Structure formats: structure tokens, C-alpha cells
């Protein structure tokens, strides 16, 4: 029906008609109608553009005719339109407006077919397009260059530069460097403010090509000269300029930062060698120092990434450092004055200059901090005298009041804390003594809740970053702890939270010092701490009280003598054990207390207190656990009746009520306490003899018999740690666990991939450890349940959730490993008959699934082991498996010919020992197979590049560890 085209032009739904044909019926038309159509569209576009009024007030229709033309080139060009570019050039010299619109065409075309993607052009497919279509990237360049030499129109030149940028990566590099285009860009087009932005982007892009030495210097020289001349001198206050600039000028300053950093990262060594370009070198860095003062996240990160490169290089190569000494001096100041907030600092300034407890934990910020800390640490090693001097003289100006402000004391505190590990122990000692004296003196000077909160957070930050100093100076340690206790009485919850966090952080390093009796002291500080605990912690929220008891438990586990450690534990637990004996009394007399918010809250917080101490004490917590254990399990049973009663009485809807939520929190914390102890228990035979049976008895039937919405995923998690630590010697216990949680949980999660997301995760963690530690339990299952196990396994690795998929694959691998192990036994024959093919097809399906971007390597390994399971067995039915696989491949890839299927099948089964080679075979074929079709292929290479990055990070970390201060104390063990 399309035929009525050429006339309507030579229009809203008229161009829409061609669009439906080009996208759905184009490759059907003979070469006849295709030459005709492409010609009358290039024709009528040209007509519109030669008329000025149509050109001016109509760019909207010229736009979608360009989009139409692009859709044509995508299909026709180059193989069936070998002379499009000549027809482009030809028609361009005939009219200025045609030429400009032709530039827009070039741009849109590259946006559609060339720079659809760009960065990952480091590969064979784009390298194909580049040097095979070289002849007409040569033409596109030549057109752009000729237009730039004799072009007049601002909008034309802009359009030309926009397409240039789009094409720079395609053009034989010869043409960028032997032409005078680089001189042209870096002078005339930097001078003109209309062309400036795009020219800078172009030149940035040039610093990213595959590489002349003289020209790269030259264009940088020109560009810097033209900025100084036409835009702003190196001395300009860019922080101010930026703050007051419009959108265009801000964008320009960002582009300048990008240009300088990218050029200098690549070409710095060039400029360092010739001691004639030193000024230009320092000048470009001086510009970046100015840019680095701008208050804008992305501009700041852009500069910082570059400084990190520079100063890491100078530290490893110190003979270069003299060159940049003044630049590094300015940079210390910029960084010290513009520190990102460490994650340890829990109070913040909002919109209305209110000091609050941050809600949000931004980890975009955590990476910015990490990079800034490293820059400051490298700068500190480069000049530790300058660094210390800056920080101490800045602190003096906080103290004399001349530069006092929240912002200034914060950034400086954060910098001081961020360089812990950079100094010798001696230099650090003198440094930290002064800083702490000054920050304490600020806590006395600066009154009001706000002041107090700001300065408290800074002093807590600093002391928590210098445990090495505290460990060596018992007097400062005690004083610092007493001050933290004082902070725990402040009304600001952010300050309290940080006081408990800092207490914990220092105790992790200094615990020994709290347990021994110090000279000058009547008793170990842990004794004093415990006796005053009720006073010390009276203002804390329960969550902070739990941290405080956690820190005490870390100190108590330093006492290696049993009677004394047990008595410290008993003393620590006096308050929660008193509350526990009371509430156990009261609640068992009147079980409806369990529906009371306050009572539930009391119980939950007792259990949480025990979890917190157990987390720190591990195996040493047993006397306390054994003190509450039976009443705790009775409480669990009692709370479980309450919950079932509300469900029976109200509906399912009961689980949404606060009463039932409150009741389940008790069950969840009890399961956490027991999981936590069993995960660290040393006495495993006692765990089995005394703890396990009452635990399974209290928890398993209750889980099995509850309604789905009232089953706690925490039961699965507790059972995973039980099986993991003692599963090897509770075979009956593991069978009960399976019997109680297996079918009923599988029923909850086998309808979709999303409902009961924690049950899903904890279910496959539990199956993986059962399959591993007590595989015999899966044989005590009736065959109907084994069948369910096999389906559940496949179901798991069908998820896109990594935290389920990885376990499904592991369990499939452990199961096949097992079946491989038993050889020619009845069960293996059953497995082949009933389950082996399910695993083969389900594995191959997820492995080929383009939507399933996770897990390639392990899936390939499982397919390898399945294939090995048959072809490595001399008496198995091998040709049957080859026929099955030929059918499966034919079905997955219907477009392959029989010989292509043959060749894939044969390469697939040729070897099944070396995973690296197998993976490569599979990838080679799947990439070829999915090229024809356009399906995605990177998922195939993603596990590898994620593994190379992790290796890269582990190497960096190992180097960083040798440089004092790069890793913070908390990251050191310890």
C-alpha cells in the first residue's frame, strides 16, 4: 500500500509510511525500488534545505526525514550504495544549508550504526568496520576538514565539529596528524566562543586515539594559550566563576577539566622530558588546581582521579617530585580543605544548617572518600613536614577563633584522621597529643548542643583512627574512653551512636589494656566499666546499649582463665539476666502479656543483648547461653502458640499486625542467638548432646505447621549453621530438618522467582550444606521427594538472583560429583534414567540464555561434568547422548544447518577435562551462532572480566598495604 510516497513531498503520517516499510518490508523490494526510494528521499530533503524559510522554521520535519534516510543507509550502505558519500560531498558544495544538514546526517548515522557503542571498540568487530570502510572515513574527514578551512556559518561549523567528534575514532590516524586540523582546532575554533565547547571535546577525543609527538605537544600549547587569551587566565578564581556561571560556562569548565586530565594522564612524560615545556606543564596543572576548587561533585571526581594518578606516580618515582613540588603543596591544601565525610562520622549538616544523624549511607561518596584519602596519604609521604605543618597551623586557627566554623573544623578533622599510618610512631605521638589537646579544648570552648555535637563527632573520628597511639598511652586511652562515656549522655542520637561505635572500634584494638590491672589503678578497667554500666548507658537507645555490651564482651574474651572470664561474663549479664528471670516469671503466669508491646519489647531487647555479647565472645559465651537455654526455648514455644492463636482467630491478615510482628521478633532473635553461638562453638559434642535436640524440637514442627506468611526464614538460616558445624554427626537430626522444611518451603518459592525472597536465599544455603555434609539424608527421602530435590536445584539456577543461582549450580555440581563417585550402583543408573537429561537441558538452556546474564563459567563447568559423566564411562550410552545433544542443539538453534550442528556437537564432546578450553569452545560457538542473530554476547565474557578486576584489586591492596596510611587501622588485623 506504500507506493504513494515521492509525490506528497516532491506530511506527518506521510513520512511515517516509509518508516513502516523500511523497518518491515525493505529487503523484499527489488534493487529497482530500493535505488528509487533512497534517491527521492535524498532529493526532497535537499529541496527543503535550499529554501531558507523551510530550513529555518521547520527543522522538525527535516529532522525525521534525516531519521528516515539514516534508516535506509543502515540497510543499504556501504554494500548496496557504494557512492553515498560522493553524493553527500557533491550536494554539500552546492548549498550551505544542505552542507550543514548533511553534517547532521553524518552525525545521526554514526549515532545509529557506528558509535551505537564506543568505549568497547577495543575489539575485533569494530576494527573490522574501521579499516575496511577506511576509504569513506577518509572522505568524511576530508569533507569536515575542507568545511573547516573555508566554512563561514557558525551553525554549519558547529554541525561539522559535532560530526568530527563522532568520527575521530574511525579516521585513519594519518589524517588527524599530517593535516593541519589539530592546529586549526587548537587555535581558530578555540578563539570563537560558539565553537569552543565542541572543539575542546574533539581535542579531548584525540588524546584517546591509537597512536606525531611534536603535534600532540603543539595542539596542547595552542589550546592552553587560547584559553589564557580568550577565556580566562590561570589566575582566575574558578570556584567563584563556576558558582556564578550559567549552564554553558559550567559545562565548559567541566570540559576543560576533562581535556586537561585526559591529555596529561597520557602525555605527561612527553612534557616532562623536554625541559623547554616546563612552564606549559606547570601551567596546565595550575589550571587543574583551580578547577579542583570548584564545588561540584563530578568536576571534583574528574580532577581527583587525575591527582590520584599523578601522586601515586610521584610516590613510586620520587625523582620526578621536585617538578611538582609547588603543585603538590597547593593540592594538599585543596584536599585538606575539601574532605569528603568519612563513613565513620555519623552526624551531618542538612539544608537548614541543622546538625542531624544522617539517614542515608551513600556509597558513591565512599568511593570518592577512598580516592581522596589515598591522594592525601600519597601527598603526606611526598612531604610529611608540609602536611603536618598545614594541619597543625590550621588547627591553631580553629582554636584562636580566626577561622572557626563547622565546615572548617570538620574537613580538617577528617583529613587528620585520614592520614593515620602515614607517620612514624614517634612523629605521630607528638602530632596526635597536640590535636587531641586542641579538640578537647574546643569541646570546652564551643558550647550549645550543636557545637558540642560537631566537635564531639570530630574528636571521636580522630581518636578512633589512632588506636596505635591509644594502645601505647594508657592515660590517653582511659581519658578518651571516659569522654566517650560522657558523649553517651548527649541527647543527640547520632553522637551517641558514634560514641558506641568509637568505643567498639578502640576496644577492637586496645582490648588487652582493659583486662589487665594498670599501674596506678585499683582494678582492671573492665571491672569499673561493668559496675557502672547501668549509669553509663542510661540515656542510650537499646540498639546502642547492645553495642556497648558487645564491646564489653570483646574485652572479657581477653581473659583466658575460665573462672575469671565466667565471672566477668556473669557480672556483665546481671542486668539482662535480672530482667529475664522477672519476665519469664510474669509471662508464663500470664501468657497474654505476650500481646503487650512493652513486654515483647523487653524480651526482644534481652535476647538482642545476649546476641550482641555472644557475637563478641563466641565459644566463651556458653555459660550464659546455658543459663537461659531451656526457658528461652519454652519462651519460643509459648510465643509460637500465641502466633498460631492469632492466625486461627483473625486470618492470614494477622501476620501483618504489630502484635504478631512483635511476637516473631522474639523467635527471630532466639534463632539468631543460637545460630551465633553454634557458629563459633568449640565444644561441638556438647552442642550435639545438650543443645541440638531441644532446638530442633522447639523449632521444626512449628515451622512446618505454620501458614507460609508466618514461617521465619531465620529458622532455615539457623539450621544451615547447625548442619554446617555438626551436620556430619547428626544424621537423624538432618533428616528431621529436611522432613520439616523441605517440601513446605519448596512449595512457597516454586511459583515465581520473587515471592518470599529471604526464604529462597536461606533455603538453597541450607540444601547446599545438607547435600555437602549429610548427603545420606537425601537418600532417606522417598523417591518422590528426590525428584523434587532435582527440580528445586534446576529451579535455583534458573533464578537471575546471584544469591540463589550460585548455590543451585554448586549443589548441581556437588550432586553430579557424587553420582560420578558411586560409579555403577543402582542409584546412578536411576539418576541417568530420571535426572541426568534434566540437568543437561536445564544447564544448557540457562547457559545460552541471553537474558540470563549471570554465571557462565560455573554453568559451563556443570555441562562439562555432565558430559564427562557419560563419555568418561566406557559402558555408558555415548551415541545416545550425542543424539540427545544433536536434538537439543537443533532445537535451540533452528537456523543452523545440519553440518553446523554436527560440528558444534563434535567440538562440544571432544574433551571434557580442561574447563578453560571447554569454555573457550562453547564461547567460540555461541558467539558465532548469536552473531547471525544479533543476540547479546558479553554475558559470555563477564565472569572473566569481573575475575580479572578482582585480581587487579587484590594486587593493588597488597601494594597499598606496604604504604603506611593507605589502609585504615580498622582494615588492619588487628
Experimentally determined by: X-ray
Grid cell for residue 12: 506527518
Per-residue buried b or exposed e for 313-325, using 16+ beta carbons within 10 Å of the residue's own CB? bbbeeeeeeebbe
> Can you name the residues that pair with 348 across neighbouring β-strands?
356
Q: What CA–CA distances, in Å, run from 16 to 13, 646, 690, 896?
A: 5, 63, 78, 36
SS3 669: helix
Please give the DSSP secondary-structure letter assigned to residue 376.
Answer: H
**Among the listed residues 205, 197, 185, 207, the one whose alpha carbon sits nearest the alpha carbon of residue 271:** 207
Q: What are phi and psi of 421, to 5 degrees?
A: 105, -15
Q: What CA–CA distances, in Å, run from 289 to 261, 262, 303?
A: 11, 15, 8
Per-residue buried b or exposed e for 213-234, using 16+ beta carbons within 10 Å of the residue's own CB? eebbbebbebbbebbeeebbeb
Question: How far apart are the C-alpha atoms of 540 and 212, rounded to whole Å?
Answer: 68
Q: HSE (CB half, 13 Å, CA atoms) of 243?
A: 7
Question: How far apart are the C-alpha atoms of 296 and 582, rounded to whole Å?
Answer: 58
Residue 108: CB atoms within 10 Å: 19
Query: DSSP string of 394-435?
Result: HHHHHHTSSS--HHHHHHHHHHHHHTTTSS-HHHHHHHHHHH
Question: How far apart are the C-alpha atoms of 470 and 480, rounded to whole Å?
Answer: 8
Report, in this order, helix, strand and coil percent for the chain, each rounded to 5.
75, 0, 20
Question: How far apart are the C-alpha atoms of 893 and 884, rounded to whole Å?
Answer: 14
Grid cell for residue 945: 572480566
CA 879, 819, 833, 840 torsion-angle sign: negative
Contact, 251 vs 315, CB < 8 A? no
Contact, 461 vs 970, CB < 8 A? no
**Among the listed residues 442, 544, 452, 438, the one whose alpha carbon sits nearest the alpha carbon of residue 498:** 544
Residue 701's contacts (CB-CB under 8 Å, 6 or more residues apart) are 740
Question: How far apart are the C-alpha atoms of 408 and 414, rounded to whole Å?
Answer: 10
Q: HSE (CB half, 13 Å, CA atoms) of 138?
A: 8
The C-alpha angle with vertex 892 and arms to 886 and 893, in degrees rounded to 5, equals: 85
Check whether the bond before 542 is cis (ω within 30° of 0): no
Contact, 640 vs 591, CB < 8 A? no
Grid cell for residue 61: 520535519
Please give the DSSP secondary-structure letter assigned to residue 728.
Answer: G
Grid cell for residue 514: 582493659
Contact, 687 vs 678, CB < 8 A? yes
Question: How far apart are the C-alpha atoms of 467 and 432, rounded to whole Å?
Answer: 11
**Among the listed residues 722, 611, 624, the one whose alpha carbon sits nearest the alpha carbon of residue 669:** 611
Question: How far apart are the C-alpha atoms of 854 and 858, rounded to whole Å?
Answer: 10
Q: HSE (CB half, 13 Å, CA atoms) of 166?
A: 22
Q: What are phi and psi of 808, to 5 degrees?
A: -55, -45
How far, rounded to the nearest angstrom, does the alpha carbon of residue 166 sit from its chain's CA centroid?
A: 30
CA 209, 213, 219, 225 torsion-angle sign: positive
Contact, 813 vs 861, CB < 8 A? yes
Q: How many helices (H) and strands (E) does the chain have?
A: 52, 2
Question: How far apart are the C-alpha atoms of 820 and 869, rounded to whole Å?
Answer: 6
Q: HSE (CB half, 13 Å, CA atoms) of 233?
A: 2
Q: HSE (CB half, 13 Å, CA atoms) of 740?
A: 22
Question: How far apart are the C-alpha atoms of 848 and 844, rounded to whole Å?
Answer: 6
Per-residue buried b or exposed e for 600-625, using 16+ beta carbons within 10 Å of the residue's own CB? bebbbbbbbbbbbbbbbbbebbbebb
Contact, 367 vs 358, CB < 8 A? no
Grid cell for residue 342: 568519612
Grid cell for residue 740: 520439616
The C-alpha angle with vertex 129 and arms to 23 and 903, in degrees rounded to 5, equals: 85
Grid cell for residue 162: 559535532
Query: DSSP string of 595-659?
Result: G-HHHHHHHHHHHHHHHHHHHHHGGGGHHHHHHHHHHHHHHHHHHHHHHHHHHHHS-GGGGGSHH
Grid cell for residue 571: 557480672
Grid cell for residue 959: 601494594
SS3 357: strand
**Among the listed residues 146, 215, 203, the one whose alpha carbon sits nearest the alpha carbon of residue 174:** 215
Residue 287's contacts (CB-CB under 8 Å, 6 or more residues apart) are 224, 227, 234, 256, 260
- Report the first-to-last Cα separation within the chain, whole angstroms: 78
Grid cell for residue 882: 550425542
Q: What are phi and psi of 349, to 5 degrees?
A: -95, 120
Q: What are phi and psi of 757, to 5 degrees?
A: -60, -40
> Can you name the residues that pair with 349 across neighbouring β-strands?
355
How far, rounded to the nearest angstrom, does the alpha carbon of residue 812 sit from its chain's CA centroid?
A: 28
SS3 4: coil
Contact, 463 vs 436, CB < 8 A? yes
Chain breaks in the chain (C to N over 2.5 A) after: 10, 211
Please give the DSSP secondary-structure letter assigned to residue 211.
Answer: -
**Among the listed residues 337, 345, 336, 335, the one whose alpha carbon sits nearest the alpha carbon of residue 455:** 345
Query: DSSP string of 486-530?
Result: HHTTSS-HHHHHHHHHHHHHHHHHHTHHHHSPPTT-SS-HHHHHH
Helical packing angle, 96-109 and 59-76, nearest 10°: 50
Question: How far apart are the C-alpha atoms of 628 and 622, rounded to whole Å?
Answer: 10
Please give the DSSP secondary-structure letter assigned to residue 25.
Answer: T
Contact, 491 vs 538, CB < 8 A? no
Q: What residue has cell string 539482662?
A: 576
How far, rounded to the nearest angstrom, does the alpha carbon of residue 955 sit from its chain's CA centroid?
A: 19
Query: DSSP string of 772-792?
Result: HH-THHHHSS-HHHHHHHHHH
Torsion from C-alpha of 398, 404, 409, 410, nearest 10 degrees: 180
> Can you name the residues that pair with 357 across neighbouring β-strands?
347
- Indicate the pairing of strand 355-357 with strand 347-349: antiparallel
> Can you name the residues that pair with 356 across neighbouring β-strands?
348
Q: HSE (CB half, 13 Å, CA atoms) of 617?
A: 31
Grid cell for residue 158: 558547529
Question: How far apart are the C-alpha atoms of 495 and 322, rounded to whole Å?
Answer: 44
Q: What CA–CA distances, in Å, run from 582 to 48, 406, 577, 724?
A: 90, 47, 9, 35
Question: How far apart are the C-alpha atoms of 256 and 286, rounded to whole Å?
Answer: 13
**Among the listed residues 584, 488, 625, 601, the one whose alpha carbon sits nearest the alpha carbon of residue 545:** 488
Grid cell for residue 610: 545476649
Q: What residue has cell string 594541619?
A: 391
Contact, 210 vs 122, CB < 8 A? no
Question: How far apart are the C-alpha atoms of 82 and 283, rounded to whole Å?
Answer: 49
Question: How far apart are the C-alpha atoms of 863 and 313, rounded to whole Å?
Answer: 46
Q: What residue has cell string 508464663?
A: 588
Grid cell for residue 399: 582554636
Residue 304: CB atoms within 10 Å: 21
SS3 681: coil
Question: How far apart are the C-alpha atoms of 193 and 170, rounded to whole Å?
Answer: 27
Query: DSSP string of 51-106?
Result: SHHHHHTTHHHHHHHHHHHHHHHHHHTTTT-TTHHHHHHHHHSS-HHHHHHHHHHH
Question: How far apart are the C-alpha atoms of 324 and 329, rounded to whole Å?
Answer: 8
Alpha helical stretches, state H, 826-877: 826-831, 837-848, 856-871
Residue 118's contacts (CB-CB under 8 Å, 6 or more residues apart) are 169
Question: How far apart are the C-alpha atoms of 912 and 872, rounded to whole Å?
Answer: 9
Contact, 760 vs 804, CB < 8 A? yes
Question: How far apart are the C-alpha atoms of 920 and 540, rounded to whole Å?
Answer: 59
Rg (CA), the chain: 36
Check whether the bond before 56 is cis (ω within 30° of 0): no
Question: How far apart are the C-alpha atoms of 514 and 530, rounded to whole Å?
Answer: 11
**Among the listed residues 541, 437, 558, the one whose alpha carbon sits nearest the alpha carbon of residue 499:** 541
> Can you name the residues that pair with 347 across neighbouring β-strands?
357
Question: How far apart are the C-alpha atoms of 885 and 715, rounded to whole Å?
Answer: 41
**Among the listed residues 543, 504, 142, the one whose alpha carbon sits nearest the alpha carbon of residue 357:** 543
Q: What residue has cell string 518451603?
A: 745
Q: What CA–CA distances, in Å, run from 767 to 274, 789, 815, 859?
A: 66, 9, 11, 19
Q: What are phi and psi of 570, to 5 degrees?
A: -60, -40
- Give me the resolution in angstroms, 1 decimal: 2.1
Question: How far apart are the C-alpha atoms of 257 and 265, rounded to whole Å?
Answer: 12
Question: How far apart are the C-alpha atoms of 206 and 948, rounded to whole Å?
Answer: 28
Contact, 734 vs 691, CB < 8 A? no
| Number of residues in the chain | 974
Q: What residue has cell string 562520622?
A: 345
Q: What are phi and psi of 850, to 5 degrees?
A: -70, -35
Residue 328: CB atoms within 10 Å: 22
Question: How far apart are the C-alpha atoms of 428 and 798, rounded to whole Å?
Answer: 55
Amino acid at each position: 500500500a506504500w507506493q504513494k510516497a515521492d509525490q506528497i513531498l516532491q506530511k506527518f503520517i506521510a513520512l511515517s509510511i516509509l518508516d513502516k516499510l523500511i523497518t518491515r518490508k525493505w529487503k523484499l523490494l527489488p534493487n529497482d525500488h530500493r535505488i528509487g526510494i533512497r534517491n527521492f528521499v535524498v532529493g526532497m530533503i535537499i529541496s527543503m534545505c535550499q529554501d531558507d524559510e523551510v530550513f529555518k522554521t521547520q527543522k522538525n520535519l527535516i529532522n525525521k526525514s534525516d531519521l528516515t534516510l539514516v534508516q535506509i543507509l543502515k540497510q543499504e550502505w556501504p554494500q548496496n550504495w557504494p557512492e553515498f558519500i560522493p553524493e553527500l560531498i557533491g550536494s554539500s558544495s552546492s548549498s550551505v544549508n544542505v552542507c550543514e544538514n548533511n553534517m547532521i546526517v553524518l552525525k545521526l548515522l554514526s549515532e545509529e550504526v557506528f558509535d551505537f557503542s564506543a568505549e568497547q571498540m577495543t575489539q575485533a568487530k569494530a576494527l573490522h568496520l574501521k579499516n575496511s570502510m577506511s576509504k569513506e572515513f577518509e572522505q568524511i574527514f576530508k569533507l569536515c576538514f575542507q568545511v573547516l578551512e573555508q566554512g563561514s556559518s557558525s551553525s554549519l561549523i558547529v554541525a561539522t565539529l559535532e560530526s568530527l567528534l563522532r568520527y575521530l575514532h574511525w579516521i585513519p590516524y594519518r589524517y588527524i596528524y599530517e593535516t593541519n586540523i589539530l592546529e586549526l582546532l587548537s587555535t581558530k575554533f578555540m578563539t570563537s566562543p560558539d565553537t569552543r565547547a565542541i572543539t575542546l571535546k574533539c581535542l579531548t577525543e584525540v588524546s584517546n586515539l591509537k597512536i606525531i609527538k611534536r603535534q600532540t605537544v603543539l595542539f596542547f600549547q595552542n589550546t592552553l594559550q587560547q584559553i589564557a587569551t580568550s577565556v580566562m587566565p590561570v589566575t582566575a578564581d574558578l570556584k567563584a566563576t563556576y558558582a556564578n556561571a550559567n549552564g554553558n560556562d559550567q559545562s565548559f569548565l567541566q570540559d576543560l577539566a576533562m581535556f586537561l586530565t585526559t591529555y596529561l594522564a597520557r602525555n605527561r612524560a612527553l612534557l616532562e622530558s623536554d625541559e623547554s615545556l616546563r612552564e606549559l606543564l606547570l601551567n596546565a596543572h595550575q589550571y587543574l588546581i583551580q578547577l579542583s576548587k570548584i564545588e561540584e561533585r563530578e568536576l571534583f571526581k574528574t580532577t581527583l582521579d587525575y591527582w590520584h594518578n599523578l601522586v601515586a606516580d610521584l610516590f613510586y618515582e620520587p625523582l620526578k617530585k621536585h617538578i611538582y613540588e609547588e603543585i603538590c603543596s597547593q593540592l594538599r591544601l585543596v584536599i585538606i580543605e575539601n574532605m569528603v565525610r568519612p563513613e565513620e562520622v555519623l552526624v551531618v549538616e542538612n539544608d537548614e544548617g541543622e546538625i542531624v544523624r544522617e539517614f542515608v549511607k551513600e556509597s558513591d561518596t565512599i568511593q570518592l572518600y577512598k580516592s581522596e584519602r589515598e591522594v592525601l596519604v600519597y601527598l603526606t609521604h611526598l612531604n610529611v613536614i608540609d602536611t603536618e605543618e598545614i594541619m597543625i597551623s590550621k588547627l591553631a586557627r580553629q582554636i584562636d577563633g580566626s577561622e572557626w566554623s563547622w565546615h572548617n573544623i570538620n574537613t580538617l578533622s577528617w583529613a587528620i584522621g585520614s592520614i593515620s599510618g602515614t607517620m612514624s610512631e614517634d612523629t605521630e605521638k607528638r602530632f596526635v597529643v597536640t590535636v587531641i589537646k586542641d579538640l578537647l579544648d574546643l569541646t570546652v570552648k564551643k558550647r550549645g548542643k550543636d557545637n558540642k555535637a560537631v566537635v564531639a563527632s570530630d574528636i571521636m573520628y580522630v581518636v578512633g583512627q589512632y588506636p596505635r597511639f591509644l594502645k601505647a598511652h594508657w592515660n590517653f586511652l582511659r581519658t578518651v574512653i571516659l569522654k566517650l562515656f560522657e558523649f553517651m549522655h548527649e541527647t543527640h542520637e547520632g553522637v551517641q551512636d558514634m560514641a558506641c561505635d568509637t568505643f567498639i572500634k578502640i576496644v577492637q584494638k586496645c582490648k588487652y589494656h582493659f583486662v589487665i590491672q594498670q599501674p596506678r589503678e585499683s582494678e582492671p578497667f573492665i571491672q569499673t566499666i561493668i559496675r557502672d554500666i547501668q549509669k553509663t548507658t542510661a540515656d542510650l537507645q537499646p540498639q546502642q546499649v547492645h553495642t556497648f555490651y558487645k564491646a564489653c564482651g570483646i574485652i572479657i574474651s581477653e581473659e583466658r582463665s575460665v573462672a575469671e572470664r565466667n565471672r566477668l561474663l556473669s557480672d556483665l549479664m546481671q542486668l539482662p539476666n535480672m530482667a529475664w528471670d522477672t519476665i519469664v516469671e510474669q509471662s508464663t503466669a500470664n501468657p497474654t502479656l505476650l500481646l503487650d508491646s512493652e513486654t515483647v519489647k523487653i524480651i526482644a531487647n534481652i535476647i538482642k543483648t545476649n546476641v550482641a555479647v555472644c557475637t563478641s565472645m563466641g565459644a566463651d559465651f556458653y555459660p550464659q547461653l546455658g543459663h537461659i537455654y531451656y526457658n528461652m526455648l519454652q519462651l519460643y514455644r509459648a510465643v509460637s502458640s500465641m502466633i498460631s492463636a492469632q492466625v486461627a482467630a483473625e486470618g492470614l491478615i494477622a501476620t501483618k499486625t504489630p502484635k504478631v510482628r512483635g511476637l516473631r521478633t522474639i523467635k527471630k532473635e532466639i534463632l539468631k542467638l543460637v545460630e551465633t553461638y553454634i557458629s563459633k562453638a568449640r565444644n561441638l559434642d556438647d552442642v550435639v548432646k545438650v543443645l541440638v535436640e531441644p532446638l530442633l524440637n522447639a523449632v521444626l514442627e512449628d515451622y512446618m505447621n505454620n501458614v507460609p506468611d508466618a514461617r521465619d526464614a531465620e529458622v532455615l538460616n539457623c539450621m544451615t549453621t547447625v548442619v554446617e558445624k555438626v551436620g556430619h554427626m547428626i544424621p537423624q537430626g538432618v533428616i528431621l530438618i529436611l522432613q520439616s522444611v523441605f517440601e513446605c518451603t519448596l512449595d512457597m518459592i516454586n511459583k515465581d522467582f520473587t515471592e518470599y525472597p529471604e526464604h529462597r536465599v536461606e533455603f538453597y544455603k541450607l540444601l547446599k550444606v545438607i547435600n555437602e555434609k549429610s548427603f545420606a539424608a537425601f537418600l532417606e527421602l522417598p523417591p518422590a521427594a528426590f525428584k523434587l530435590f532435582v527440580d528445586a536445584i534446576c529451579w535455583a539456577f534458573k533464578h537471575n538472583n546471584r544469591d540463589v543461582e550460585v548455590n543451585g549450580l554448586q549443589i548441581a555440581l556437588d550432586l553430579v560429583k557424587n553420582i560420578e563417585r558411586m560409579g555403577n550402583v543402582p542409584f546412578a543408573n536411576e539418576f541417568h534414567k530420571n535426572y541426568f537429561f534434566i540437568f543437561v537441558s536445564e544447564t544448557f538452556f540457562v547457559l545460552t540464555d541471553s537474558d540470563h546474564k549471570s554465571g557462565f563459567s560455573k554453568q559451563a563447568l556443570l555441562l562439562m561434568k555432565l558430559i564427562s559423566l557419560v563419555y568418561d564411562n566406557k559402558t555408558s550410552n555415548q551415541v545416545y547422548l550425542s543424539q540427545y545433544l544433536a536434538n537439543m542443539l537443533s532445537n535451540a538453534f533452528p537456523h543452523l544447518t545440519s553440518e553446523q550442528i554436527a560440528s558444534f556437537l563434535s567440538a562440544l564432546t571432544k574433551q571434557y577435562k580442561d574447563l578453560v578450553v571447554f569454555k573457550g569452545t562453547l564461547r567460540d560457538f555461541l558467539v558465532q551462532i548469536k552473531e547471525v542473530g544479533g543476540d547479546p554476547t558479553d554475558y559470555l565474557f563477564a565472569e572473566d572480566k569481573e575475575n580479572a578486576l578482582m585480581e587487579q584489586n587484590r594486587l593493588e591492596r597488597e601494594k597499598a598495604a606496604k604504604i603506611g596510611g593507605l589502609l585504615k587501622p580498622s582494615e588492619l588485623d588487628d
